[PDB]
Short mmCIF file of C-alpha atoms and ligand atoms in Angstrom, two decimals:
data_model
loop_
_atom_site.label_atom_id
_atom_site.label_comp_id
_atom_site.label_asym_id
_atom_site.label_seq_id
_atom_site.Cartn_x
_atom_site.Cartn_y
_atom_site.Cartn_z
CA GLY A 4 -61.63 -12.81 -28.77
CA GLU A 5 -65.25 -13.01 -30.29
CA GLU A 6 -66.42 -15.40 -27.31
CA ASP A 7 -64.01 -14.47 -24.71
CA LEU A 8 -65.59 -10.74 -24.98
CA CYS A 9 -68.95 -12.15 -24.92
CA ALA A 10 -68.25 -14.42 -21.61
CA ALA A 11 -66.82 -11.14 -20.48
CA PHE A 12 -70.06 -9.11 -21.16
CA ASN A 13 -72.23 -11.65 -19.79
CA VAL A 14 -70.81 -11.34 -16.33
CA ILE A 15 -70.43 -7.65 -16.33
CA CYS A 16 -74.16 -6.95 -17.38
CA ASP A 17 -75.47 -8.76 -14.93
CA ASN A 18 -73.27 -7.67 -11.75
CA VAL A 19 -72.36 -3.72 -12.58
CA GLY A 20 -75.72 -1.99 -12.14
CA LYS A 21 -75.94 1.03 -10.02
CA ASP A 22 -72.59 2.71 -11.37
CA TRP A 23 -72.63 1.97 -14.92
CA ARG A 24 -72.44 5.24 -15.95
CA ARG A 25 -68.77 5.62 -14.09
CA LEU A 26 -67.89 2.04 -16.09
CA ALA A 27 -68.77 3.55 -19.51
CA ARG A 28 -66.69 6.87 -18.99
CA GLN A 29 -63.51 4.49 -18.09
CA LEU A 30 -64.21 2.93 -21.33
CA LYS A 31 -63.85 6.34 -23.13
CA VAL A 32 -67.48 6.18 -24.14
CA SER A 33 -68.59 9.59 -24.92
CA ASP A 34 -71.45 11.36 -22.85
CA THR A 35 -73.00 12.22 -25.92
CA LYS A 36 -73.43 8.18 -26.50
CA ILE A 37 -74.41 7.99 -22.63
CA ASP A 38 -77.32 10.19 -22.67
CA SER A 39 -78.34 8.19 -25.62
CA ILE A 40 -78.33 4.92 -23.79
CA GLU A 41 -80.16 6.21 -21.21
CA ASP A 42 -83.16 7.08 -23.70
CA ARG A 43 -82.80 3.85 -25.45
CA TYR A 44 -83.19 1.46 -22.95
CA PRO A 45 -84.79 3.26 -19.46
CA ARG A 46 -86.43 -0.15 -18.61
CA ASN A 47 -83.59 -2.68 -18.16
CA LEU A 48 -80.23 -1.49 -16.35
CA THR A 49 -78.72 -4.67 -17.37
CA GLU A 50 -79.53 -3.97 -21.07
CA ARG A 51 -77.68 -0.24 -20.91
CA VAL A 52 -74.82 -1.81 -19.52
CA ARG A 53 -74.45 -3.88 -22.40
CA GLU A 54 -75.11 -1.34 -24.99
CA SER A 55 -72.30 0.53 -23.19
CA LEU A 56 -69.85 -2.30 -23.78
CA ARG A 57 -70.64 -2.94 -27.53
CA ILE A 58 -70.19 0.36 -28.24
CA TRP A 59 -66.87 0.20 -26.88
CA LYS A 60 -65.97 -3.52 -28.64
CA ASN A 61 -66.90 -1.49 -32.13
CA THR A 62 -64.46 1.51 -30.67
CA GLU A 63 -61.35 -0.80 -31.04
CA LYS A 64 -61.84 -3.91 -33.50
CA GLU A 65 -58.60 -5.30 -32.91
CA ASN A 66 -57.87 -3.63 -29.58
CA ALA A 67 -60.85 -4.65 -27.46
CA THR A 68 -59.65 -7.01 -25.39
CA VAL A 69 -60.45 -8.46 -21.84
CA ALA A 70 -57.13 -7.36 -20.04
CA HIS A 71 -58.53 -3.71 -20.86
CA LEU A 72 -62.09 -4.48 -19.78
CA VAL A 73 -60.33 -5.44 -16.52
CA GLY A 74 -58.37 -2.50 -16.18
CA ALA A 75 -61.91 -0.21 -16.61
CA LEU A 76 -63.46 -2.01 -14.01
CA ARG A 77 -60.49 -1.76 -11.47
CA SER A 78 -60.17 2.03 -12.22
CA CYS A 79 -64.02 2.23 -10.94
CA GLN A 80 -63.25 0.23 -7.88
CA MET A 81 -65.69 -2.44 -9.52
CA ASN A 82 -62.74 -4.91 -8.13
CA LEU A 83 -65.22 -8.10 -7.47
CA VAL A 84 -66.72 -7.83 -10.99
CA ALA A 85 -62.96 -7.52 -12.59
CA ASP A 86 -61.93 -10.64 -10.49
CA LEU A 87 -64.43 -12.85 -11.90
CA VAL A 88 -63.76 -11.39 -15.56
CA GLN A 89 -60.64 -12.58 -15.05
CA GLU A 90 -61.42 -15.94 -13.52
CA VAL A 91 -63.75 -16.66 -16.34
CA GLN A 92 -61.45 -15.40 -18.79
CA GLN A 93 -58.30 -17.92 -17.20
CA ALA A 94 -60.91 -20.84 -17.02
CA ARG A 95 -61.82 -20.33 -20.88
CA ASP A 96 -57.84 -19.95 -21.22
CA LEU A 97 -57.52 -23.70 -20.04
CA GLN A 98 -60.68 -25.18 -21.85
CA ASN A 99 -59.02 -24.36 -25.38
CA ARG A 100 -56.38 -27.11 -24.68
CA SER A 101 -58.50 -29.97 -23.03
CA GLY A 102 -61.69 -29.03 -24.47
CA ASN B 17 -88.00 -7.19 -19.38
CA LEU B 18 -84.60 -8.82 -19.85
CA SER B 19 -83.43 -9.24 -16.45
CA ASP B 20 -83.76 -13.36 -16.77
CA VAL B 21 -82.39 -13.15 -20.17
CA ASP B 22 -78.93 -11.50 -18.95
CA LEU B 23 -79.15 -13.65 -15.58
CA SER B 24 -79.27 -16.84 -18.14
CA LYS B 25 -76.44 -15.60 -19.96
CA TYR B 26 -74.45 -14.71 -17.25
CA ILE B 27 -75.58 -18.34 -15.22
CA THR B 28 -74.49 -19.85 -18.70
CA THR B 29 -71.33 -18.23 -18.93
CA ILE B 30 -70.37 -19.42 -15.57
CA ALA B 31 -71.84 -23.09 -16.14
CA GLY B 32 -69.69 -23.53 -19.11
CA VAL B 33 -66.70 -22.92 -16.94
CA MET B 34 -67.29 -25.58 -14.47
CA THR B 35 -67.79 -29.49 -14.38
CA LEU B 36 -71.02 -30.77 -13.41
CA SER B 37 -69.55 -32.35 -10.07
CA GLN B 38 -67.46 -29.21 -9.63
CA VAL B 39 -70.92 -27.18 -9.43
CA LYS B 40 -72.64 -29.94 -7.54
CA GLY B 41 -69.46 -29.32 -4.76
CA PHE B 42 -69.98 -25.65 -4.72
CA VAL B 43 -73.38 -25.15 -4.39
CA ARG B 44 -73.60 -28.26 -1.60
CA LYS B 45 -71.20 -25.74 0.19
CA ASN B 46 -73.40 -22.80 0.01
CA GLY B 47 -76.84 -23.73 0.74
CA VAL B 48 -78.19 -26.14 -1.79
CA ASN B 49 -79.33 -28.93 0.03
CA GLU B 50 -79.23 -32.77 -1.50
CA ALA B 51 -83.04 -32.40 -1.96
CA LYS B 52 -82.68 -29.62 -4.25
CA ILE B 53 -79.85 -30.80 -6.23
CA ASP B 54 -81.78 -34.50 -6.82
CA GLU B 55 -85.21 -32.87 -7.78
CA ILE B 56 -82.60 -30.89 -10.25
CA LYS B 57 -80.95 -33.71 -11.23
CA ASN B 58 -84.06 -36.02 -12.36
CA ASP B 59 -85.57 -33.04 -14.14
CA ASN B 60 -82.67 -32.94 -16.38
CA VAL B 61 -81.42 -36.64 -17.12
CA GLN B 62 -80.21 -36.36 -20.44
CA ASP B 63 -79.17 -32.13 -20.24
CA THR B 64 -75.99 -32.05 -18.05
CA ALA B 65 -75.70 -28.75 -19.47
CA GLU B 66 -79.23 -27.46 -17.92
CA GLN B 67 -78.45 -29.53 -14.48
CA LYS B 68 -75.32 -26.95 -14.14
CA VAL B 69 -77.58 -24.00 -14.83
CA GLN B 70 -80.61 -24.82 -12.67
CA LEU B 71 -78.11 -25.86 -9.92
CA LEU B 72 -76.34 -22.28 -10.19
CA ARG B 73 -79.55 -20.91 -10.47
CA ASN B 74 -81.20 -22.00 -7.39
CA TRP B 75 -77.66 -21.05 -5.53
CA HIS B 76 -77.86 -17.70 -7.04
CA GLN B 77 -81.04 -16.68 -5.52
CA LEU B 78 -80.23 -17.48 -2.07
CA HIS B 79 -77.02 -15.10 -1.46
CA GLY B 80 -75.84 -11.17 -0.62
CA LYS B 81 -73.86 -10.21 -3.92
CA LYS B 82 -70.96 -9.81 -1.15
CA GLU B 83 -71.07 -13.20 -0.22
CA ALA B 84 -71.85 -14.77 -3.78
CA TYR B 85 -68.98 -12.92 -5.32
CA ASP B 86 -66.40 -13.91 -2.71
CA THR B 87 -67.75 -17.52 -2.72
CA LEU B 88 -67.92 -17.90 -6.67
CA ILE B 89 -64.46 -16.06 -7.18
CA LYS B 90 -62.74 -18.08 -4.55
CA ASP B 91 -64.42 -21.71 -6.18
CA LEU B 92 -63.17 -20.22 -9.70
CA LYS B 93 -59.39 -19.26 -8.40
CA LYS B 94 -59.26 -22.73 -6.89
CA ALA B 95 -59.86 -24.98 -9.90
CA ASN B 96 -57.93 -22.52 -12.00
CA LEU B 97 -54.59 -23.08 -9.81
CA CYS B 98 -55.63 -26.83 -9.80
CA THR B 99 -55.64 -26.81 -13.75
CA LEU B 100 -52.96 -24.88 -14.17
CA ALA B 101 -50.77 -26.93 -11.77
CA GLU B 102 -51.43 -29.84 -13.96
CA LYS B 103 -51.14 -28.46 -17.15
CA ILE B 104 -47.61 -26.77 -16.43
CA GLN B 105 -46.49 -29.96 -14.80
CA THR B 106 -47.31 -31.96 -17.47
CA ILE B 107 -45.09 -29.76 -20.15
CA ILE B 108 -42.54 -29.29 -17.57
CA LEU B 109 -42.14 -33.27 -17.40
CA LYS B 110 -42.55 -33.72 -20.94
CA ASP B 111 -39.62 -31.20 -21.66
CA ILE B 112 -37.30 -32.30 -18.72
CA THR B 113 -37.42 -35.40 -20.09
CA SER B 114 -37.30 -34.86 -23.94
CA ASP B 115 -33.67 -34.95 -25.63
CA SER B 116 -34.88 -32.69 -28.49
CA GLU B 117 -35.31 -29.01 -28.27
CA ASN B 118 -38.59 -27.43 -27.04
CA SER B 119 -38.73 -23.85 -27.93
CA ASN B 120 -42.38 -24.33 -27.57
CA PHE B 121 -42.44 -24.21 -23.97
CA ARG B 122 -42.49 -20.29 -23.42
CA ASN B 123 -45.48 -20.32 -25.75
CA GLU B 124 -46.91 -23.08 -24.08
CA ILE B 125 -46.83 -21.52 -20.60
CA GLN B 126 -48.25 -17.78 -22.25
CA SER B 127 -51.10 -19.46 -23.68
CA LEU B 128 -52.09 -20.96 -20.23
CA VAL B 129 -52.19 -17.44 -19.01
CA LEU B 130 -53.84 -15.45 -21.99
CA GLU B 131 -55.60 -12.10 -21.29
CA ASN C 10 -6.22 -9.86 -30.72
CA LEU C 11 -9.55 -9.69 -29.28
CA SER C 12 -10.09 -13.40 -29.45
CA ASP C 13 -9.72 -13.82 -25.77
CA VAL C 14 -11.90 -10.97 -24.66
CA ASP C 15 -15.02 -12.09 -26.36
CA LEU C 16 -14.25 -15.27 -25.37
CA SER C 17 -14.15 -13.97 -21.62
CA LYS C 18 -17.39 -12.06 -22.03
CA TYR C 19 -19.40 -15.07 -23.53
CA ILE C 20 -17.88 -17.35 -20.54
CA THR C 21 -18.60 -14.90 -17.70
CA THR C 22 -22.06 -14.80 -19.25
CA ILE C 23 -22.50 -18.30 -19.09
CA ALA C 24 -20.88 -18.31 -15.33
CA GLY C 25 -23.59 -15.46 -14.34
CA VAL C 26 -26.07 -17.74 -14.60
CA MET C 27 -25.23 -21.00 -13.06
CA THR C 28 -24.13 -21.52 -9.02
CA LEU C 29 -20.51 -22.49 -8.43
CA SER C 30 -21.95 -26.17 -7.48
CA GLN C 31 -23.57 -26.14 -10.91
CA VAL C 32 -20.44 -25.14 -12.57
CA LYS C 33 -18.30 -27.81 -10.71
CA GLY C 34 -21.00 -30.18 -11.34
CA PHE C 35 -21.65 -29.51 -14.88
CA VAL C 36 -17.35 -29.67 -16.00
CA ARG C 37 -16.94 -32.53 -13.99
CA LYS C 38 -19.15 -34.45 -15.74
CA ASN C 39 -17.78 -33.68 -19.11
CA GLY C 40 -14.16 -33.93 -18.70
CA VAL C 41 -12.32 -31.96 -16.33
CA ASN C 42 -11.14 -34.11 -13.40
CA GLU C 43 -11.22 -33.26 -9.88
CA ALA C 44 -7.53 -32.56 -9.93
CA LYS C 45 -7.83 -29.67 -12.40
CA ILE C 46 -11.34 -28.64 -10.02
CA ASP C 47 -8.87 -28.34 -6.84
CA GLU C 48 -5.95 -26.52 -8.39
CA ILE C 49 -8.41 -23.74 -9.73
CA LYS C 50 -10.38 -24.06 -6.41
CA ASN C 51 -7.27 -23.06 -4.50
CA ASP C 52 -6.11 -20.19 -7.35
CA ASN C 53 -9.12 -18.19 -6.49
CA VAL C 54 -9.91 -18.93 -2.96
CA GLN C 55 -11.73 -15.57 -2.34
CA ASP C 56 -13.19 -15.04 -5.96
CA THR C 57 -16.01 -17.52 -6.45
CA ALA C 58 -16.90 -16.18 -9.68
CA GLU C 59 -13.57 -16.52 -11.14
CA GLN C 60 -13.40 -19.94 -9.82
CA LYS C 61 -16.60 -20.31 -12.32
CA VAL C 62 -15.11 -18.65 -15.02
CA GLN C 63 -11.85 -20.66 -14.86
CA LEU C 64 -13.44 -24.04 -14.32
CA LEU C 65 -15.84 -23.24 -17.74
CA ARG C 66 -12.38 -21.87 -19.80
CA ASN C 67 -11.26 -25.69 -19.22
CA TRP C 68 -14.07 -26.74 -19.98
CA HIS C 69 -14.64 -25.10 -23.04
CA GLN C 70 -11.05 -25.89 -24.60
CA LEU C 71 -11.57 -29.26 -24.41
CA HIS C 72 -14.44 -30.12 -26.77
CA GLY C 73 -15.57 -29.87 -30.21
CA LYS C 74 -18.66 -27.56 -31.02
CA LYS C 75 -21.30 -29.89 -31.60
CA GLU C 76 -20.50 -31.74 -27.99
CA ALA C 77 -19.88 -27.93 -26.29
CA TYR C 78 -23.28 -26.63 -27.46
CA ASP C 79 -25.48 -30.11 -26.88
CA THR C 80 -23.85 -30.31 -23.59
CA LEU C 81 -24.18 -26.77 -21.99
CA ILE C 82 -27.79 -26.51 -23.60
CA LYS C 83 -29.28 -29.26 -22.00
CA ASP C 84 -27.52 -28.41 -18.62
CA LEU C 85 -29.05 -25.00 -18.72
CA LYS C 86 -31.97 -26.55 -20.01
CA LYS C 87 -32.58 -28.84 -16.95
CA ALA C 88 -31.49 -26.42 -14.59
CA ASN C 89 -34.13 -23.95 -15.73
CA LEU C 90 -36.47 -26.45 -15.78
CA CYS C 91 -36.16 -27.28 -12.12
CA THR C 92 -35.98 -23.61 -11.26
CA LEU C 93 -39.30 -22.88 -13.03
CA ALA C 94 -41.12 -25.71 -11.42
CA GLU C 95 -40.07 -24.62 -8.05
CA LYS C 96 -41.11 -20.95 -8.55
CA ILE C 97 -44.32 -21.74 -10.22
CA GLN C 98 -45.29 -24.19 -7.41
CA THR C 99 -44.56 -21.61 -4.89
CA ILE C 100 -46.95 -18.95 -6.51
CA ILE C 101 -49.60 -21.82 -7.11
CA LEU C 102 -49.03 -22.82 -3.15
CA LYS C 103 -49.33 -19.17 -2.30
CA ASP C 104 -52.27 -18.29 -4.54
CA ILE C 105 -54.07 -21.48 -3.53
CA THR C 106 -54.11 -21.05 -0.04
CA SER C 107 -54.92 -17.42 0.02
CA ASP C 108 -58.29 -15.81 0.89
CA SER C 109 -57.75 -12.84 -1.06
CA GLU C 110 -57.68 -12.23 -5.01
CA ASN C 111 -54.28 -12.88 -6.48
CA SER C 112 -55.25 -10.93 -9.84
CA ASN C 113 -51.23 -10.83 -10.04
CA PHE C 114 -50.80 -14.69 -10.75
CA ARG C 115 -50.66 -14.20 -14.97
CA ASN C 116 -47.76 -11.46 -14.68
CA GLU C 117 -46.01 -13.47 -12.23
CA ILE C 118 -45.96 -16.36 -14.35
CA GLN C 119 -44.93 -13.70 -17.71
CA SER C 120 -42.34 -12.46 -15.90
CA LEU C 121 -40.51 -16.16 -15.60
CA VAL C 122 -40.73 -16.60 -18.97
CA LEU C 123 -39.88 -12.66 -20.23
CA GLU C 124 -38.09 -12.97 -23.56
CA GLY D 17 -33.88 -5.31 -21.55
CA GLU D 18 -30.25 -3.98 -21.63
CA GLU D 19 -28.33 -6.53 -19.57
CA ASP D 20 -30.61 -9.21 -21.76
CA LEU D 21 -29.66 -7.74 -24.88
CA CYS D 22 -26.11 -7.53 -23.95
CA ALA D 23 -25.88 -11.29 -22.51
CA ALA D 24 -27.69 -12.25 -25.98
CA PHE D 25 -24.89 -10.43 -27.79
CA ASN D 26 -21.97 -12.09 -26.06
CA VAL D 27 -23.48 -15.33 -26.66
CA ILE D 28 -24.03 -15.08 -30.30
CA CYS D 29 -20.71 -12.94 -30.91
CA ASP D 30 -18.40 -15.73 -29.75
CA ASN D 31 -20.47 -18.15 -31.62
CA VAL D 32 -21.74 -17.39 -35.28
CA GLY D 33 -18.62 -16.60 -37.17
CA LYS D 34 -18.30 -17.69 -40.69
CA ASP D 35 -22.24 -16.90 -41.93
CA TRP D 36 -22.41 -14.09 -40.09
CA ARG D 37 -23.50 -11.88 -43.33
CA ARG D 38 -26.58 -14.18 -43.40
CA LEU D 39 -27.53 -13.10 -40.15
CA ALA D 40 -26.92 -9.08 -40.61
CA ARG D 41 -29.46 -9.71 -43.51
CA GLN D 42 -32.18 -11.30 -41.35
CA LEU D 43 -32.10 -8.61 -38.68
CA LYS D 44 -32.43 -6.11 -42.08
CA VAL D 45 -29.28 -4.89 -41.98
CA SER D 46 -28.62 -3.08 -45.03
CA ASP D 47 -25.73 -4.24 -47.59
CA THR D 48 -24.70 -0.41 -47.32
CA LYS D 49 -23.82 -0.61 -43.55
CA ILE D 50 -22.55 -4.59 -43.87
CA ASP D 51 -19.95 -3.47 -46.38
CA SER D 52 -18.68 -0.61 -44.03
CA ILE D 53 -18.84 -3.38 -41.21
CA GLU D 54 -16.40 -5.58 -43.23
CA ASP D 55 -14.68 -2.62 -43.69
CA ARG D 56 -14.39 -1.05 -40.08
CA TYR D 57 -13.28 -4.39 -38.76
CA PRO D 58 -11.16 -6.64 -41.01
CA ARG D 59 -9.06 -8.25 -37.93
CA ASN D 60 -11.97 -10.26 -35.75
CA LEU D 61 -14.83 -11.85 -37.39
CA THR D 62 -16.47 -11.65 -33.41
CA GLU D 63 -16.06 -7.70 -33.67
CA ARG D 64 -17.68 -7.79 -37.06
CA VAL D 65 -20.65 -9.71 -35.54
CA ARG D 66 -21.26 -7.56 -32.67
CA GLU D 67 -21.52 -4.22 -34.34
CA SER D 68 -24.06 -5.81 -37.01
CA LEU D 69 -25.97 -6.23 -33.82
CA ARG D 70 -25.39 -2.94 -32.06
CA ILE D 71 -26.53 -1.29 -35.40
CA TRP D 72 -30.23 -3.58 -34.96
CA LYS D 73 -30.24 -2.33 -31.51
CA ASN D 74 -30.28 1.59 -32.54
CA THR D 75 -32.63 0.42 -35.47
CA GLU D 76 -35.22 -0.16 -33.01
CA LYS D 77 -35.11 1.22 -29.43
CA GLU D 78 -38.32 -0.02 -28.26
CA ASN D 79 -38.62 -3.29 -30.37
CA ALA D 80 -35.00 -4.89 -29.95
CA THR D 81 -36.17 -7.77 -28.12
CA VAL D 82 -34.23 -11.11 -27.58
CA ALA D 83 -37.30 -13.01 -28.94
CA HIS D 84 -36.39 -11.47 -32.33
CA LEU D 85 -32.80 -12.36 -32.20
CA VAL D 86 -34.11 -15.52 -31.61
CA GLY D 87 -36.15 -15.48 -34.52
CA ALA D 88 -33.52 -13.98 -37.08
CA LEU D 89 -31.10 -16.89 -35.75
CA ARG D 90 -33.55 -19.44 -36.24
CA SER D 91 -34.15 -18.28 -39.87
CA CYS D 92 -30.30 -18.80 -40.81
CA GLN D 93 -30.79 -22.35 -39.41
CA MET D 94 -28.35 -21.24 -36.99
CA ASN D 95 -30.65 -23.21 -34.29
CA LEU D 96 -27.95 -24.16 -31.92
CA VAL D 97 -26.92 -20.56 -30.83
CA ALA D 98 -30.62 -19.63 -30.64
CA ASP D 99 -31.11 -22.59 -28.26
CA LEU D 100 -28.53 -21.31 -26.31
CA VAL D 101 -29.40 -17.71 -26.27
CA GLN D 102 -32.94 -18.82 -25.25
CA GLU D 103 -31.78 -21.08 -22.47
CA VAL D 104 -29.34 -18.17 -21.11
CA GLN D 105 -32.28 -15.68 -21.11
CA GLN D 106 -34.65 -17.90 -19.41
CA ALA D 107 -31.94 -18.54 -16.90
CA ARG D 108 -31.53 -15.03 -16.58
CA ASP D 109 -35.53 -14.66 -15.99
CA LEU D 110 -35.13 -17.09 -13.39
CA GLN D 111 -32.41 -14.87 -11.14
CA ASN D 112 -34.27 -11.61 -11.05
CA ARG D 113 -36.73 -13.08 -8.64
CA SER D 114 -34.09 -15.03 -6.24
CA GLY D 115 -31.02 -12.61 -7.29
NA1 LIG E 211 -45.70 -27.36 -11.09
NA1 LIG E 212 -36.89 -23.58 -21.18
#
């Protein structure tokens, strides 16, 4: 839930970069908001990606799932990132029981 | 400005889903020589968590994205598959050897694969 | 009036989830002597589906509910657990030895335990 | 889905019997309907059980799941029947792949 989405965000933030606007669009983040993200954080590309995700999490309290993050990523051909997010999530699933 | 914070958050996340020996194994296979490992090992004798992060940090700053991805993903996939195999084997042997009902089996399997 | 139709629908449903050898094995363990089996086997040389149903019919009319339940449930449980073990092992070995991504692993496991 | 619910229904029908009205109640089958099922099929107890289930499937087109049938059974202490429905369902899951 909470910590899982953090883990996903941390992976996505530091690995998306150039085509982040494409991803924002898939997460149904309005252009009105994407314009303002470009304004708020002109310095760091990684900070822009994070805020994009934060808006998306606030946009669905209960429905903001890692499964749907992975769909988003795959629809933008960001498949290697999707893969990594899935594997990290899977790893986390297997620790809850042991750790 | 935040490049290194976000790189740190990311690498910490990966570190948290690997054991110290697993990280040592991985970076050894992908260009971090036993020199750098020992230098890192003695800089954090108490802090095994930081060992993993420095190890991954050193590995990360050595590789093209396509290579970093493929290798790390492959490494996590195999470790996940092994741990699934062990955990599912235990549930199945436990249940197959029990006399009681195990209405929990489906739920057990489902949790292992939660996403 | 419909007692036997409903008994037939039920036993057909169990037959459909067991192999002929598996049914033969089960009924042998629970009071259907090799005599009755052969008699049934020669009545339905072409129809192996009907063989399973007759075998189960014969078994069914020999037992208190508590015994019929426990015995059949146990039998299906173990058969299920072996098939799960075989099918999950196959998925795991397939994915652990592949170089490509297997984003299908979770889906694959989930379908095996669909309810 | 369709054939799974049939399998479950066949197991339940031929094994519930005496306390079927208890089961109907757990499936949120109204008493207005349960009275009428007593009237429609006074001959066979097994036939009364089936129509109770049929009404339940018509009452949730998409959400009539075997999982919920099993919950129903267990809440009326019909555990052995629940067990058998589960094992048949699990068996069926394992054939789709091989058969
Ligand atoms: Na296994
Ligand atoms: Na089972």
